[PDB]
């Protein structure tokens, strides 16, 4: 078997002027802990943060090849900043280059679109990609995304007294509120998932640049 | 009209392209090799074409594996090509077997490679003569390989522009020391011989580069002569001129 599971869950949320990519720092094999701090969210330059979740070797290979492609793009276009959509197309081509022996990874890239709004792209191991407002990857994706849908997009929430006829209107979430929600969802996942814990690394992409925040999770 | 292609015999049976490659070798700077009682010393004259050259940084002598040193005169890129082939050959020997390649075996491999460049008109003969050698399980060996692919073992070897005077000095060395030279005194004498041979190229300044591979001094590994020993050899050579 050339593949394996090293655990790990990632979360990319695109705001109106920011993008956050968060992942737990625990590396595991079966029921053992390999490392309590093995980052899987990487600033790849040009205000683009990438995370390749799944098979750790394939994730490392894909991240390395994407960084190589960004370097070659800078070599060919005179240090021109790579746009997030161009990066997404490049990652699609990189993934499809191994169609029949695929990178066993689901990768998420986050950043700002050319208009300045937060952009998040999710990729299938075979090469399909889609721009999303939010996407969760990894084992604990099912323990995190419903809560964010409830809390960011106000799903199943209605304005009180309207008899469920008026939905709760959407609102601008600041990056701080989004960070609070990410922290709470990851703490819940740590509580209920044995592969989540040991620390939460969040990379925030704004117009200023890429900002990294680390928060400790429970170590059991 | 037999000198325009590599693999053509002249009516006398000569390969004129190999002779022209030898002329190119004779145009090069003087490099020597001395086989001491337990090792080999390589010295080369590095012409200082301009004051802007970084001193002690344009290294000519090359190591193959860890026990073989190679120095050459003529077309330096051809010598580098030959040394790259020799490194590949030593690696292949050390992969198929486990011992480091013996010096005679390495000499044969290089000779075969150089001779293969005289077999076709689609390729050019090497424009270098390589002095190479080292220490193996059978002791120290010194070889000089010519553009034809010919190579022999030598007690002392010299090529380049000042090859004649260097050969005379090496002959004097062989005559005066039948007992076998010592590695350190061999380094000093290599400095002396290079300085003496530079008189045929006195129009320009030169930098002396020495390396050695001795069973006792360098533990059978090829190392460059630097620091106190290099300066000592330089002073010995300068004094020996007068």
């Amino acid at each position: 078997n050339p593949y394996g599971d090293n655990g790990g869950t990632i979360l990319g949320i695109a705001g109106e002027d920011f993008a956050v990519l968060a992942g737990d720092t625990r590396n595991i094999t079966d029921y053992s802990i390999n490392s309590r701090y093995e980052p899987k969210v990487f600033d790849c330059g040009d205000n683009i943060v990438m995370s390749a979740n799944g098979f750790a070797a394939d994730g490392d290979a894909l991240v390395k090849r994407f960084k190589n492609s960004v370097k070659w793009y800078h070599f060919d276009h005179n240090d021109k900043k790579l746009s997030i959509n161009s990066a997404a197309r490049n990652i699609q081509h990189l993934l499809y280059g191994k169609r029949f022996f695929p990178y066993y990874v689901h990768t998420i890239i986050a950043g700002l679109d050319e208009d300045g709004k937060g952009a998040v792209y999710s990729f299938d191991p075979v090469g399909s990609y889609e721009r999303e407002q939010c996407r969760a990857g990894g084992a604990a994706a099912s323990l995190i995304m419903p809560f964010l849908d409830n809390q960011v997009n106000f799903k199943n929430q209605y304005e009180p007294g309207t008899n469920g006829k008026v939905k709760k209107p959407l609102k601008y979430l600041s990056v701080e509120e989004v960070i609070k929600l990410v922290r709470d969802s990851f703490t819940s996942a740590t509580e209920r998932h044995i592969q989540v814990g040991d620390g939460l690394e969040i990379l925030i992409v704004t117009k200023d640049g890429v900002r990294k925040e680390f928060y400790e999770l429970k170590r059991d | 009209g037999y000198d325009l292609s590599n693999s053509v015999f002249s009516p006398d049976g000569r390969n004129f392209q190999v002779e022209y490659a030898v002329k190119a070798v004779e145009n090069g700077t003087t490099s020597i090799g001395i086989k001491c009682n337990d090792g080999v010393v390589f010295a080369v004259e590095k012409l200082i074409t301009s004051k802007l050259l970084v001193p002690q940084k344009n290294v000519k002598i090359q190591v193959v594996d860890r026990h073989i040193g190679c120095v050459y005169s003529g077309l330096i890129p051809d010598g580098r090509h030959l040394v790259n082939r020799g490194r590949e050959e030593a690696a292949s020997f050390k992969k198929l077997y486990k011992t480091p390649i013996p010096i005679p075996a390495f000499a044969d491999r290089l000779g075969q490679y150089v001779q293969a460049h005289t077999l076709y008109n689609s390729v050019r003969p090497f424009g270098v003569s390589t002095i190479f050698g080292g220490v193996d399980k059978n002791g120290a060996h010194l070889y000089m390989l010519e553009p034809s692919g010919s190579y022999w073992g030598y007690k002392g070897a010299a090529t380049g522009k000042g090859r004649q005077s260097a050969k005379a000095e090496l002959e004097k060395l062989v005559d005066h020391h039948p007992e076998g030279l010592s590695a350190r005194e061999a380094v000093k004498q290599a400095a002396k011989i290079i300085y003496l041979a530079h008189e045929d190229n006195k129009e320009k300044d030169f930098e002396l580069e020495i390396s050695w591979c001795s069973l006792s001094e360098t533990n059978g590994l090829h190392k460059f002569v630097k620091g106190d020993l290099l300066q000592e050899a330089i002073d010995f050579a300068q004094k020996e001129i007068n």
């Binding site: 390999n34 093995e38 290979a61 022996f101 | 594996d65």
Partner: protein
């Protein structure tokens, strides 16, 4: 594997890294070979500990010597600021392992590269036959990752514990873990090798240490 090496355990202290492995090559349940050195010094600032297939370990040893020889070529600073780093050696080994796995011809080993970088940082990283790499304050392979890792993590639980850990404490923990592994691992040996890479005192290789 058919002839196999057991656990390699390692940790980093305030001034360097310690790596240990035992000198036994098992043949199934037969304790066949007892002179197998599985710690491989590369240069003076790197030790490579290999577990698993012994023939593949010998192949990796040959590759490491070839890497040192190749680095020495045309490099007057090969014994100097242009020497091979633990990170370079690990990157090469991980590339080799990943390319072997991608060709479905894996080198059936787990490698820990231990060393100190030129700037003085401790290097301690792991790679296996799948190409999976990770770093930790303490690393162990096979039976070590299950039994010795808990004992070493009691000494260095996180990165902030590394500067508080002296060489004596780390070596004592490593020797205790080796004794425990001898007690509870059937494919282990009394005799083991221990290497200390210190940013100040350099590489210290201790052979034929006994539980």
């Amino acid at each position: 594997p058919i002839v196999t090496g057991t656990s390699v355990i390692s940790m980093k202290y305030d001034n360097g890294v310690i790596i240990a492995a035992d000198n036994l090559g098992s043949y199934g349940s037969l304790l066949r070979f007892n002179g197998v050195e599985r710690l491989i010094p590369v240069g003076d600032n790197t030790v490579v500990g290999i577990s698993g297939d012994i023939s593949d370990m010998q192949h990796i040893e040959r590759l490491l010597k070839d890497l040192v020889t190749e680095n020495a070529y045309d490099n007057p600073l090969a014994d100097a600021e242009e020497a091979l780093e633990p990170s370079y050696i690990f990157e090469y080994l991980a590339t080799v392992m990943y390319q072997r796995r991608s060709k479905m011809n894996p080198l059936w080993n787990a490698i820990i590269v231990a060393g100190v970088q030129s700037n003085g940082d401790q290097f301690l990283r792991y790679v296996n036959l799948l190409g999976v790499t990770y770093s930790s304050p303490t690393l162990a392979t096979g039976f070590g990752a299950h039994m010795a890792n808990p004992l070493l993590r009691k000494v260095v639980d996180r990165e902030s514990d590394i500067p508080k850990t002296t060489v004596q404490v780390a070596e004592e923990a490593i020797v205790n873990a080796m004794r425990v592994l001898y007690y509870r691992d059937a494919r282990s040996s009394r005799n083991f090798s221990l290497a200390i890479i210190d940013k100040n005192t350099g590489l210290t290789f201790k052979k034929n240490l006994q539980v």
